[PDB]
Amino acid sequence: APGYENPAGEIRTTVKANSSTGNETAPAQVSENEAESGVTVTDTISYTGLVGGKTYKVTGSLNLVENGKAVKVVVTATAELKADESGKGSWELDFGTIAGLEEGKSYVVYESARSLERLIDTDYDNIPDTPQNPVHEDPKDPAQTITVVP
Numbered sequence: 036a037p038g039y040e041n042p043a044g045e046i047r048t049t050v051k052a053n054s055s056t057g058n059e060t061a062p063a064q065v066s067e068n069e070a071e072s073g074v075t076v077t078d079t080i081s082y083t084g085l086v087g088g089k090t091y092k093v094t095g096s097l098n099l100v101e102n103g104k105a106v107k108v109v110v111t112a113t114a115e116l117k118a119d120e121s122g123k124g125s126w127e128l129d130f131g132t133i134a135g136l137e138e139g140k141s142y143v144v145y146e147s148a149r150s151l152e153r154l155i156d157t158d159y160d161n162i163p164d165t166p167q168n169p170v171h172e173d174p175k176d177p178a179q180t181i182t183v184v185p
């Protein structure tokens with residue numbers, strides 16, 4: 036086949052819980068009363084180095100964090116999303132309305148964006164043979180974290 040330069044992708048994530056958004060410094064926060072009432076959780080996935088116009092199966096997980104480690108999947112969400120023509124842009128993944136988040140606990144979002152098509156050449160025959168799949172799985176990323184406060 037002709038010249039095939041492998042795409043090299045990166046995804047970053049920002050969680051929103053009700054009206055609170057995580058950032059580089061501090062997690063999103065919801066009160067115990069908000070947690071009892073059901074928390075709307077959405078995650079923004081900022082991507083670069085994807086293949087323009089290609090569809091990615093995005094899977095997200097909301098994870099209980101203890102001692103800086105993800106110890107329990109609370110909920111997952113999934114959608115098939117198209118990369119912008121430039122291969123850079125953002126997606127929104129809607130987790131819906133989450134019950135049972137506990138006061139004093141932190142929860143972290145992970146994202147996996149896996150192309151439907153084979154876009155990575157693993158064997159240098161110039162033929163792509165495996166999906167492109169950047170991930171963001173940082174249990175200590177405050178931008179992906181929700182903390183329940185009194």
Ligand SMILES: [Mg+2]
Nearest residue numbers: 156158162164
């Ligand atoms: Mg190949």
